[PDB]
Design a protein around this ligand. Structure first.
Ligand SMILES: CC(=O)N[C@@H]1[C@@H](O)[C@H](O)[C@@H](CO)O[C@H]1O
Ligand SMILES: *[C@@H]1O[C@H](CO)[C@@H](O)[C@H](O)[C@H]1NC(C)=O
Ligand SMILES: *[C@@H]1O[C@H](CO)[C@@H](O)[C@H](O)[C@H]1NC(C)=O
Ligand SMILES: *[C@@H]1O[C@H](CO)[C@@H](O)[C@H](O)[C@H]1NC(C)=O
Ligand SMILES: *[C@@H]1O[C@H](CO)[C@@H](O)[C@H](O)[C@H]1NC(C)=O
Lengths: 196, 49, 98, 99
Protein backbone atom coordinates (compact mmCIF):
# COMPACT_ATOMS: atom_id res chain seq x y z
CA UNK A 1 0.00 0.00 0.00
CA UNK A 2 1.00 3.61 0.60
CA UNK A 3 3.52 2.72 3.28
CA UNK A 4 7.30 2.93 3.57
CA UNK A 5 7.28 0.83 6.76
CA UNK A 6 6.21 -2.22 4.77
CA UNK A 7 8.53 -1.31 1.87
CA UNK A 8 11.59 -1.42 4.13
CA UNK A 9 10.72 -5.00 5.10
CA UNK A 10 9.70 -5.69 1.50
CA UNK A 11 13.11 -4.92 -0.01
CA UNK A 12 14.74 -7.39 2.40
CA UNK A 13 13.53 -10.40 0.40
CA UNK A 14 15.75 -9.43 -2.56
CA UNK A 15 15.12 -8.92 -6.28
CA UNK A 16 11.88 -10.93 -6.29
CA UNK A 17 10.06 -7.79 -7.43
CA UNK A 18 12.60 -7.39 -10.22
CA UNK A 19 11.83 -10.91 -11.42
CA UNK A 20 8.06 -10.45 -11.12
CA UNK A 21 8.10 -7.10 -12.93
CA UNK A 22 10.40 -8.50 -15.63
CA UNK A 23 8.06 -11.47 -16.11
CA UNK A 24 5.02 -9.20 -16.36
CA UNK A 25 6.82 -6.86 -18.77
CA UNK A 26 7.80 -9.85 -20.87
CA UNK A 27 4.17 -10.97 -20.85
CA UNK A 28 3.04 -7.51 -21.97
CA UNK A 29 5.60 -7.21 -24.77
CA UNK A 30 4.64 -10.77 -25.72
CA UNK A 31 1.01 -9.64 -26.01
CA UNK A 32 2.19 -6.83 -28.28
CA UNK A 33 4.15 -9.41 -30.29
CA UNK A 34 1.07 -11.65 -30.48
CA UNK A 35 -1.10 -8.85 -31.85
CA UNK A 36 1.63 -7.76 -34.27
CA UNK A 37 2.19 -11.29 -35.58
CA UNK A 38 -1.52 -12.07 -35.93
CA UNK A 39 -2.61 -8.79 -37.52
CA UNK A 40 0.44 -6.86 -38.76
CA UNK A 41 1.41 -9.47 -41.36
CA UNK A 42 1.64 -6.67 -43.95
CA UNK A 43 3.23 -3.22 -43.90
CA UNK A 44 0.92 -1.65 -46.51
CA UNK A 45 -2.59 -0.51 -45.58
CA UNK A 46 -5.06 -1.19 -48.38
CA UNK A 47 -8.06 1.04 -49.08
CA UNK A 48 -11.36 -0.69 -49.78
CA UNK A 49 -12.55 0.27 -53.29
CA UNK A 50 -15.57 2.60 -53.44
CA UNK A 51 -17.56 0.35 -55.78
CA UNK A 52 -18.17 -2.92 -53.94
CA UNK A 53 -19.60 -5.22 -56.62
CA UNK A 54 -17.74 -8.53 -56.31
CA UNK A 55 -19.54 -10.87 -58.68
CA UNK A 56 -22.63 -11.09 -56.48
CA UNK A 57 -20.77 -11.82 -53.25
CA UNK A 58 -21.83 -9.61 -50.34
CA UNK A 59 -19.26 -8.47 -47.77
CA UNK A 60 -21.41 -5.75 -46.17
CA UNK A 61 -21.44 -7.47 -42.77
CA UNK A 62 -17.65 -7.91 -42.74
CA UNK A 63 -16.44 -4.77 -44.54
CA UNK A 64 -16.12 -1.59 -42.45
CA UNK A 65 -19.20 0.57 -41.96
CA UNK A 66 -18.53 4.20 -42.98
CA UNK A 67 -21.50 5.47 -40.94
CA UNK A 68 -20.21 3.87 -37.73
CA UNK A 69 -17.95 6.18 -35.68
CA UNK A 70 -15.39 3.39 -35.24
CA UNK A 71 -15.78 2.07 -38.83
CA UNK A 72 -16.41 -1.45 -37.51
CA UNK A 73 -18.27 -4.04 -39.55
CA UNK A 74 -21.77 -5.14 -38.50
CA UNK A 75 -20.43 -8.59 -37.59
CA UNK A 76 -17.58 -6.93 -35.71
CA UNK A 77 -20.18 -4.70 -34.04
CA UNK A 78 -22.06 -7.81 -32.88
CA UNK A 79 -18.82 -9.32 -31.57
CA UNK A 80 -17.99 -6.03 -29.85
CA UNK A 81 -21.35 -5.82 -28.07
CA UNK A 82 -21.76 -9.51 -27.19
CA UNK A 83 -18.40 -9.90 -25.43
CA UNK A 84 -18.41 -8.51 -21.89
CA UNK A 85 -15.92 -5.72 -22.48
CA UNK A 86 -13.03 -5.05 -20.14
CA UNK A 87 -11.05 -1.80 -20.13
CA UNK A 88 -8.64 -0.87 -22.92
CA UNK A 89 -6.60 1.78 -21.10
CA UNK A 90 -8.38 4.60 -22.93
CA UNK A 91 -8.70 8.13 -21.54
CA UNK A 92 -11.74 10.42 -21.84
CA UNK A 93 -10.96 12.96 -19.08
CA UNK A 94 -13.24 11.01 -16.74
CA UNK A 95 -10.78 10.89 -13.84
CA UNK A 96 -10.99 7.10 -14.17
CA UNK A 97 -9.44 7.46 -17.66
CA UNK A 98 -11.82 5.47 -19.87
CA UNK A 99 -15.54 4.84 -19.71
CA UNK A 100 -16.24 1.12 -19.49
CA UNK A 101 -19.61 0.27 -21.05
CA UNK A 102 -21.72 -0.74 -18.04
CA UNK A 103 -20.11 -4.20 -17.91
CA UNK A 104 -16.84 -4.37 -15.94
CA UNK A 105 -16.40 -0.92 -14.39
CA UNK A 106 -14.67 -2.64 -11.43
CA UNK A 107 -11.39 -2.17 -13.34
CA UNK A 108 -11.36 1.28 -11.75
CA UNK A 109 -11.38 -0.50 -8.39
CA UNK A 110 -8.56 -2.73 -9.62
CA UNK A 111 -6.69 0.49 -10.41
CA UNK A 112 -6.55 1.49 -6.74
CA UNK A 113 -4.75 -1.68 -5.59
CA UNK A 114 -1.33 -0.63 -6.88
CA UNK A 115 -2.11 -1.98 -10.32
CA UNK A 116 -3.31 -0.96 -13.76
CA UNK A 117 -4.21 -2.40 -17.14
CA UNK A 118 -2.05 -1.16 -19.95
CA UNK A 119 -3.59 -0.18 -23.28
CA UNK A 120 -2.63 -2.29 -26.29
CA UNK A 121 -0.05 -0.75 -28.59
CA UNK A 122 -2.57 -1.08 -31.43
CA UNK A 123 -5.87 0.52 -30.45
CA UNK A 124 -9.05 -1.29 -31.45
CA UNK A 125 -9.47 1.37 -34.14
CA UNK A 126 -6.12 0.61 -35.76
CA UNK A 127 -6.57 -3.10 -35.04
CA UNK A 128 -9.75 -2.85 -37.10
CA UNK A 129 -7.76 -0.88 -39.67
CA UNK A 130 -5.25 -3.74 -39.90
CA UNK A 131 -8.14 -6.20 -40.21
CA UNK A 132 -9.72 -4.09 -42.96
CA UNK A 133 -6.39 -3.95 -44.80
CA UNK A 134 -6.13 -7.75 -44.57
CA UNK A 135 -9.71 -8.13 -45.81
CA UNK A 136 -9.15 -5.72 -48.71
CA UNK A 137 -5.98 -7.55 -49.71
CA UNK A 138 -7.80 -10.88 -49.56
CA UNK A 139 -10.76 -9.61 -51.61
CA UNK A 140 -8.70 -7.68 -54.17
CA UNK A 141 -5.25 -9.30 -54.28
CA UNK A 142 -5.95 -12.82 -53.03
CA UNK A 143 -3.01 -14.68 -51.49
CA UNK A 144 -0.42 -12.67 -53.43
CA UNK A 145 -0.24 -9.75 -50.98
CA UNK A 146 1.33 -12.02 -48.35
CA UNK A 147 4.27 -13.23 -50.46
CA UNK A 148 5.44 -9.84 -51.73
CA UNK A 149 3.69 -7.09 -53.66
CA UNK A 150 -0.10 -7.01 -53.72
CA UNK A 151 -1.43 -8.23 -57.07
CA UNK A 152 -5.07 -7.34 -57.71
CA UNK A 153 -7.42 -10.01 -59.06
CA UNK A 154 -11.23 -10.19 -59.47
CA UNK A 155 -12.95 -12.03 -56.64
CA UNK A 156 -14.52 -14.75 -58.86
CA UNK A 157 -11.00 -15.51 -60.13
CA UNK A 158 -9.77 -15.94 -56.55
CA UNK A 159 -12.80 -18.18 -55.95
CA UNK A 160 -11.73 -20.25 -58.97
CA UNK A 161 -8.24 -20.50 -57.46
CA UNK A 162 -9.64 -21.63 -54.10
CA UNK A 163 -11.80 -24.21 -55.89
CA UNK A 164 -8.72 -25.54 -57.70
CA UNK A 165 -6.87 -25.69 -54.39
CA UNK A 166 -9.25 -28.30 -52.94
CA UNK A 167 -9.28 -30.67 -55.92
CA UNK A 168 -12.52 -29.31 -57.41
CA UNK A 169 -12.27 -28.07 -60.99
CA UNK A 170 -12.69 -24.29 -60.96
CA UNK A 171 -15.16 -24.32 -63.87
CA UNK A 172 -17.82 -25.51 -61.40
CA UNK A 173 -17.46 -22.22 -59.52
CA UNK A 174 -18.46 -20.32 -62.65
CA UNK A 175 -21.34 -22.67 -63.48
CA UNK A 176 -22.95 -21.93 -60.09
CA UNK A 177 -21.45 -18.54 -59.26
CA UNK A 178 -24.81 -17.07 -58.22
CA UNK A 179 -25.61 -20.15 -56.14
CA UNK A 180 -22.27 -19.88 -54.33
CA UNK A 181 -22.82 -16.17 -53.70
CA UNK A 182 -26.32 -16.79 -52.34
CA UNK A 183 -25.11 -19.61 -50.08
CA UNK A 184 -22.28 -17.40 -48.79
CA UNK A 185 -24.67 -14.53 -48.06
CA UNK A 186 -27.16 -16.84 -46.34
CA UNK A 187 -24.38 -18.45 -44.29
CA UNK A 188 -23.13 -15.02 -43.20
CA UNK A 189 -26.67 -14.06 -42.20
CA UNK A 190 -27.05 -17.30 -40.24
CA UNK A 191 -23.68 -16.58 -38.62
CA UNK A 192 -25.05 -13.22 -37.47
CA UNK A 193 -28.25 -14.85 -36.20
CA UNK A 194 -26.37 -17.59 -34.33
CA UNK A 195 -23.95 -15.13 -32.73
CA UNK A 196 -26.77 -12.82 -31.65
CA UNK B 1 6.84 -6.30 12.19
CA UNK B 2 6.27 -10.05 12.62
CA UNK B 3 2.63 -9.79 11.56
CA UNK B 4 3.56 -7.58 8.59
CA UNK B 5 6.22 -10.13 7.63
CA UNK B 6 3.58 -12.87 7.69
CA UNK B 7 1.20 -10.76 5.59
CA UNK B 8 4.02 -9.89 3.17
CA UNK B 9 4.84 -13.57 2.75
CA UNK B 10 1.18 -14.40 2.16
CA UNK B 11 0.59 -11.62 -0.37
CA UNK B 12 3.93 -12.31 -2.08
CA UNK B 13 3.01 -15.98 -2.42
CA UNK B 14 -0.40 -14.97 -3.79
CA UNK B 15 1.24 -12.63 -6.31
CA UNK B 16 3.85 -15.25 -7.25
CA UNK B 17 1.09 -17.81 -7.84
CA UNK B 18 -0.82 -15.22 -9.88
CA UNK B 19 2.27 -14.49 -11.97
CA UNK B 20 2.97 -18.19 -12.52
CA UNK B 21 -0.62 -18.89 -13.57
CA UNK B 22 -0.44 -15.84 -15.85
CA UNK B 23 2.77 -17.30 -17.29
CA UNK B 24 1.11 -20.68 -17.86
CA UNK B 25 -2.04 -19.25 -19.43
CA UNK B 26 0.15 -16.79 -21.35
CA UNK B 27 2.05 -19.74 -22.79
CA UNK B 28 -1.39 -21.15 -23.62
CA UNK B 29 -2.39 -17.82 -25.19
CA UNK B 30 0.93 -17.73 -27.05
CA UNK B 31 0.33 -21.21 -28.44
CA UNK B 32 -3.16 -20.11 -29.50
CA UNK B 33 -1.70 -16.93 -31.03
CA UNK B 34 0.98 -18.86 -32.92
CA UNK B 35 -1.85 -21.07 -34.17
CA UNK B 36 -3.78 -17.92 -35.11
CA UNK B 37 -0.79 -16.49 -36.99
CA UNK B 38 -0.40 -19.83 -38.77
CA UNK B 39 -4.11 -19.71 -39.64
CA UNK B 40 -3.75 -16.12 -40.86
CA UNK B 41 -0.85 -17.17 -43.09
CA UNK B 42 -2.36 -20.42 -44.39
CA UNK B 43 -6.14 -19.79 -44.32
CA UNK B 44 -6.38 -16.00 -44.76
CA UNK B 45 -3.12 -15.31 -46.63
CA UNK B 46 -3.42 -18.61 -48.51
CA UNK B 47 -5.32 -21.86 -48.91
CA UNK B 48 -4.39 -24.64 -46.50
CA UNK B 49 -4.49 -28.26 -47.69
CA UNK C 1 2.90 -23.71 -45.74
CA UNK C 2 2.70 -19.94 -46.18
CA UNK C 3 5.23 -17.94 -44.12
CA UNK C 4 6.52 -21.08 -42.38
CA UNK C 5 10.01 -21.09 -43.93
CA UNK C 6 10.31 -17.35 -44.49
CA UNK C 7 8.26 -14.69 -46.24
CA UNK C 8 7.68 -15.55 -49.89
CA UNK C 9 7.61 -18.81 -51.80
CA UNK C 10 10.11 -20.95 -49.88
CA UNK C 11 12.67 -22.62 -52.15
CA UNK C 12 15.08 -24.25 -49.68
CA UNK C 13 16.78 -23.75 -46.33
CA UNK C 14 20.26 -24.19 -44.87
CA UNK C 15 20.99 -24.96 -41.20
CA UNK C 16 23.81 -23.20 -39.39
CA UNK C 17 24.71 -24.06 -35.80
CA UNK C 18 24.99 -21.19 -33.33
CA UNK C 19 25.49 -21.12 -29.54
CA UNK C 20 22.41 -22.85 -28.13
CA UNK C 21 20.42 -22.53 -31.35
CA UNK C 22 20.12 -22.85 -35.10
CA UNK C 23 19.98 -20.31 -37.92
CA UNK C 24 17.95 -21.15 -41.02
CA UNK C 25 18.97 -19.36 -44.22
CA UNK C 26 15.54 -19.47 -45.85
CA UNK C 27 16.16 -19.23 -49.59
CA UNK C 28 12.79 -17.97 -50.85
CA UNK C 29 11.35 -16.68 -54.12
CA UNK C 30 9.85 -13.18 -54.14
CA UNK C 31 8.03 -11.61 -57.12
CA UNK C 32 8.60 -8.04 -58.25
CA UNK C 33 8.27 -5.69 -61.23
CA UNK C 34 4.57 -6.29 -61.78
CA UNK C 35 2.56 -5.29 -64.84
CA UNK C 36 -1.19 -4.72 -65.01
CA UNK C 37 -3.42 -6.40 -67.60
CA UNK C 38 -7.06 -7.01 -68.45
CA UNK C 39 -8.26 -10.43 -67.31
CA UNK C 40 -11.23 -12.72 -67.96
CA UNK C 41 -12.54 -15.79 -66.10
CA UNK C 42 -12.98 -17.92 -69.24
CA UNK C 43 -12.71 -17.69 -73.02
CA UNK C 44 -15.82 -18.15 -75.15
CA UNK C 45 -15.05 -19.98 -78.39
CA UNK C 46 -17.35 -21.95 -80.71
CA UNK C 47 -20.15 -21.38 -78.21
CA UNK C 48 -18.31 -23.19 -75.40
CA UNK C 49 -16.31 -21.96 -72.42
CA UNK C 50 -12.59 -22.74 -72.16
CA UNK C 51 -10.91 -22.47 -68.76
CA UNK C 52 -7.12 -22.44 -68.28
CA UNK C 53 -5.60 -25.71 -67.11
CA UNK C 54 -2.87 -24.20 -64.94
CA UNK C 55 -2.51 -20.44 -65.51
CA UNK C 56 -4.64 -17.33 -65.96
CA UNK C 57 -5.90 -15.29 -68.91
CA UNK C 58 -4.44 -11.79 -69.28
CA UNK C 59 -4.43 -9.18 -72.03
CA UNK C 60 -2.01 -6.35 -72.72
CA UNK C 61 -4.73 -4.39 -74.53
CA UNK C 62 -5.13 -6.09 -77.91
CA UNK C 63 -3.92 -9.71 -77.55
CA UNK C 64 -4.96 -12.38 -75.05
CA UNK C 65 -2.46 -14.77 -73.47
CA UNK C 66 -2.35 -17.32 -70.65
CA UNK C 67 0.41 -16.96 -68.07
CA UNK C 68 1.59 -18.78 -64.98
CA UNK C 69 0.01 -17.34 -61.85
CA UNK C 70 3.36 -16.46 -60.23
CA UNK C 71 5.66 -15.37 -63.08
CA UNK C 72 4.80 -13.41 -66.22
CA UNK C 73 5.34 -15.45 -69.39
CA UNK C 74 2.75 -15.01 -72.15
CA UNK C 75 1.79 -18.06 -74.18
CA UNK C 76 -0.70 -18.47 -77.01
CA UNK C 77 -3.93 -19.96 -75.66
CA UNK C 78 -4.53 -23.42 -77.13
CA UNK C 79 -6.36 -26.63 -76.23
CA UNK C 80 -3.29 -28.03 -74.45
CA UNK C 81 -3.41 -25.41 -71.67
CA UNK C 82 -7.21 -25.02 -71.59
CA UNK C 83 -10.20 -27.33 -71.16
CA UNK C 84 -13.77 -26.90 -72.40
CA UNK C 85 -16.54 -27.40 -69.83
CA UNK C 86 -19.96 -25.76 -70.05
CA UNK C 87 -21.75 -23.33 -72.33
CA UNK C 88 -21.33 -19.64 -73.12
CA UNK C 89 -24.27 -18.37 -71.07
CA UNK C 90 -23.73 -19.13 -67.38
CA UNK C 91 -20.24 -17.60 -67.17
CA UNK C 92 -20.78 -14.08 -65.77
CA UNK C 93 -18.05 -12.15 -67.57
CA UNK C 94 -16.97 -14.49 -70.37
CA UNK C 95 -14.95 -12.84 -73.14
CA UNK C 96 -14.88 -13.60 -76.86
CA UNK C 97 -11.47 -14.72 -78.11
CA UNK C 98 -9.81 -17.48 -80.16
CA UNK D 1 -2.15 10.33 -25.36
CA UNK D 2 -4.71 7.72 -24.36
CA UNK D 3 -1.93 6.00 -22.39
CA UNK D 4 -1.18 9.13 -20.36
CA UNK D 5 0.88 12.31 -20.45
CA UNK D 6 4.11 12.71 -22.43
CA UNK D 7 6.58 15.41 -21.33
CA UNK D 8 9.74 16.37 -23.18
CA UNK D 9 8.46 15.06 -26.52
CA UNK D 10 6.75 17.26 -29.11
CA UNK D 11 3.73 15.91 -30.95
CA UNK D 12 4.12 15.71 -34.73
CA UNK D 13 1.21 15.50 -37.17
CA UNK D 14 3.42 13.53 -39.57
CA UNK D 15 3.51 9.78 -38.96
CA UNK D 16 6.60 7.55 -39.11
CA UNK D 17 7.17 3.91 -38.28
CA UNK D 18 7.19 3.02 -34.59
CA UNK D 19 10.56 3.15 -32.86
CA UNK D 20 9.75 3.38 -29.13
CA UNK D 21 6.12 2.34 -28.51
CA UNK D 22 4.56 4.68 -25.97
CA UNK D 23 1.01 3.40 -26.20
CA UNK D 24 -2.38 3.62 -27.93
CA UNK D 25 -0.69 3.91 -31.31
CA UNK D 26 1.65 6.69 -30.13
CA UNK D 27 5.42 6.20 -30.55
CA UNK D 28 8.46 8.32 -29.69
CA UNK D 29 11.69 8.89 -31.59
CA UNK D 30 14.85 10.99 -31.53
CA UNK D 31 14.68 12.86 -34.83
CA UNK D 32 16.98 15.24 -36.71
CA UNK D 33 14.90 18.06 -38.21
CA UNK D 34 16.14 21.39 -39.58
CA UNK D 35 13.21 23.51 -38.35
CA UNK D 36 15.41 25.57 -36.02
CA UNK D 37 18.11 26.03 -38.70
CA UNK D 38 20.75 25.43 -36.02
CA UNK D 39 23.42 22.76 -35.74
CA UNK D 40 23.07 19.61 -37.83
CA UNK D 41 23.40 17.04 -35.03
CA UNK D 42 21.78 19.09 -32.24
CA UNK D 43 18.62 21.17 -32.67
CA UNK D 44 17.75 24.11 -30.42
CA UNK D 45 14.99 22.15 -28.65
CA UNK D 46 14.64 18.56 -27.47
CA UNK D 47 14.76 16.17 -30.42
CA UNK D 48 12.27 13.74 -28.83
CA UNK D 49 9.10 13.73 -30.92
CA UNK D 50 5.90 11.72 -30.53
CA UNK D 51 3.64 10.67 -33.37
CA UNK D 52 0.73 8.45 -34.28
CA UNK D 53 2.06 5.16 -35.61
CA UNK D 54 2.31 4.82 -39.38
CA UNK D 55 0.79 1.40 -40.02
CA UNK D 56 2.34 1.59 -43.49
CA UNK D 57 2.13 3.29 -46.87
CA UNK D 58 -1.60 3.62 -47.58
CA UNK D 59 -1.55 1.61 -50.78
CA UNK D 60 -4.71 1.62 -52.89
CA UNK D 61 -5.03 -1.71 -54.67
CA UNK D 62 -6.46 -0.90 -58.10
CA UNK D 63 -9.37 -3.31 -57.94
CA UNK D 64 -11.54 -3.84 -61.00
CA UNK D 65 -13.76 -6.69 -62.14
CA UNK D 66 -11.51 -7.21 -65.19
CA UNK D 67 -8.04 -6.09 -64.02
CA UNK D 68 -5.14 -8.30 -62.91
CA UNK D 69 -1.48 -7.87 -61.95
CA UNK D 70 1.24 -10.31 -63.06
CA UNK D 71 4.85 -10.12 -61.80
CA UNK D 72 7.54 -10.04 -64.49
CA UNK D 73 10.71 -10.40 -62.37
CA UNK D 74 11.84 -11.90 -59.08
CA UNK D 75 14.37 -11.72 -56.27
CA UNK D 76 16.02 -14.71 -54.62
CA UNK D 77 15.75 -13.62 -51.00
CA UNK D 78 17.85 -15.18 -48.25
CA UNK D 79 16.29 -14.15 -44.95
CA UNK D 80 17.46 -15.46 -41.58
CA UNK D 81 15.35 -17.26 -38.98
CA UNK D 82 16.99 -17.78 -35.59
CA UNK D 83 15.53 -20.58 -33.47
CA UNK D 84 16.70 -21.33 -29.92
CA UNK D 85 17.12 -25.09 -29.53
CA UNK D 86 18.73 -26.05 -26.22
CA UNK D 87 19.29 -23.80 -23.23
CA UNK D 88 22.39 -24.32 -21.12
CA UNK D 89 21.71 -27.46 -19.11
CA UNK D 90 22.22 -26.63 -15.45
CA UNK D 91 22.88 -28.69 -12.33
CA UNK D 92 22.19 -27.44 -8.82
CA UNK D 93 23.75 -29.27 -5.90
CA UNK D 94 20.72 -28.71 -3.66
CA UNK D 95 22.77 -29.32 -0.52
CA UNK D 96 25.67 -27.17 -1.72
CA UNK D 97 23.39 -24.30 -2.75
CA UNK D 98 21.09 -24.19 0.27
CA UNK D 99 23.66 -25.32 2.84
C1 LIG E 1 -3.75 -1.95 -68.41
C2 LIG E 1 -3.66 -0.87 -67.37
O1 LIG E 1 -3.50 0.31 -67.67
N1 LIG E 1 -3.77 -1.28 -66.10
C3 LIG E 1 -3.72 -0.39 -64.94
C4 LIG E 1 -4.87 0.61 -64.96
O2 LIG E 1 -5.92 0.14 -64.12
C5 LIG E 1 -4.42 2.00 -64.51
O3 LIG E 1 -4.00 2.78 -65.63
C6 LIG E 1 -3.34 2.01 -63.42
C7 LIG E 1 -3.90 1.77 -62.04
O4 LIG E 1 -2.86 1.56 -61.09
O5 LIG E 1 -2.32 1.02 -63.63
C8 LIG E 1 -2.39 0.32 -64.84
C1 LIG F 1 -17.56 -3.99 -63.70
O1 LIG F 1 -17.31 -2.58 -63.32
C2 LIG F 1 -17.87 -2.11 -62.08
C3 LIG F 1 -16.74 -2.08 -61.07
O2 LIG F 1 -16.99 -2.96 -59.99
C4 LIG F 1 -19.03 -3.00 -61.65
O3 LIG F 1 -19.82 -2.31 -60.69
C5 LIG F 1 -19.87 -3.34 -62.88
O4 LIG F 1 -21.06 -4.01 -62.48
C6 LIG F 1 -19.08 -4.23 -63.83
N1 LIG F 1 -19.52 -4.02 -65.20
C7 LIG F 1 -19.48 -4.98 -66.14
C8 LIG F 1 -19.97 -4.59 -67.50
O5 LIG F 1 -19.06 -6.10 -65.90
C1 LIG G 1 -19.23 -13.94 -78.10
O1 LIG G 1 -19.10 -15.32 -78.51
C2 LIG G 1 -20.35 -15.95 -78.83
C3 LIG G 1 -20.03 -17.40 -79.15
O2 LIG G 1 -18.74 -17.76 -78.67
C4 LIG G 1 -21.02 -15.22 -79.99
O3 LIG G 1 -22.28 -15.82 -80.27
C5 LIG G 1 -21.20 -13.75 -79.65
O4 LIG G 1 -21.72 -13.05 -80.77
C6 LIG G 1 -19.87 -13.13 -79.23
N1 LIG G 1 -20.04 -11.73 -78.86
C7 LIG G 1 -20.79 -11.30 -77.84
C8 LIG G 1 -20.83 -9.82 -77.63
O5 LIG G 1 -21.41 -12.08 -77.10
C1 LIG H 1 0.56 -7.45 -76.86
O1 LIG H 1 1.48 -8.55 -77.06
C2 LIG H 1 1.63 -8.94 -78.44
C3 LIG H 1 2.57 -10.12 -78.45
O2 LIG H 1 3.22 -10.25 -79.70
C4 LIG H 1 2.15 -7.77 -79.26
O3 LIG H 1 2.22 -8.15 -80.63
C5 LIG H 1 1.23 -6.57 -79.11
O4 LIG H 1 1.77 -5.44 -79.79
C6 LIG H 1 1.05 -6.23 -77.63
N1 LIG H 1 0.14 -5.11 -77.47
C7 LIG H 1 0.43 -4.03 -76.74
C8 LIG H 1 -0.63 -2.97 -76.68
O5 LIG H 1 1.50 -3.91 -76.15
C1 LIG I 1 15.28 -8.63 -62.94
O1 LIG I 1 15.86 -8.00 -61.79
C2 LIG I 1 17.29 -8.13 -61.71
C3 LIG I 1 17.71 -7.51 -60.40
O2 LIG I 1 18.43 -8.43 -59.59
C4 LIG I 1 17.93 -7.47 -62.92
O3 LIG I 1 19.35 -7.65 -62.86
C5 LIG I 1 17.39 -8.09 -64.20
O4 LIG I 1 17.90 -7.40 -65.33
C6 LIG I 1 15.86 -8.01 -64.21
N1 LIG I 1 15.33 -8.68 -65.39
C7 LIG I 1 14.70 -8.03 -66.38
C8 LIG I 1 14.22 -8.87 -67.52
O5 LIG I 1 14.53 -6.81 -66.35
Amino acid sequence: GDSTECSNLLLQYGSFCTQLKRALTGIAVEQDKNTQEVFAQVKQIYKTPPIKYFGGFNFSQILPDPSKPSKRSPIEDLLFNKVTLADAGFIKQYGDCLGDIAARDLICAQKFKGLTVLPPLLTDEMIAQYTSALLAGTITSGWTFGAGPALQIPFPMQMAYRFNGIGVTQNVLYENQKLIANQFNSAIGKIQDSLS
Amino acid sequence: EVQIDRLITGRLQSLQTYVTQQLIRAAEIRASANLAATKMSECVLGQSK
Amino acid sequence: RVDFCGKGYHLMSFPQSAPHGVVFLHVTYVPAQEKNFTTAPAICHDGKAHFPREGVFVSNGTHWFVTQRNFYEPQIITTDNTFVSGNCDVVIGIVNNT
Amino acid sequence: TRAGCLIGAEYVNNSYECDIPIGAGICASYQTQTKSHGSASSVASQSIIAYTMSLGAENSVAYSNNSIAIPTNFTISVTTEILPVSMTKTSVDCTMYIC
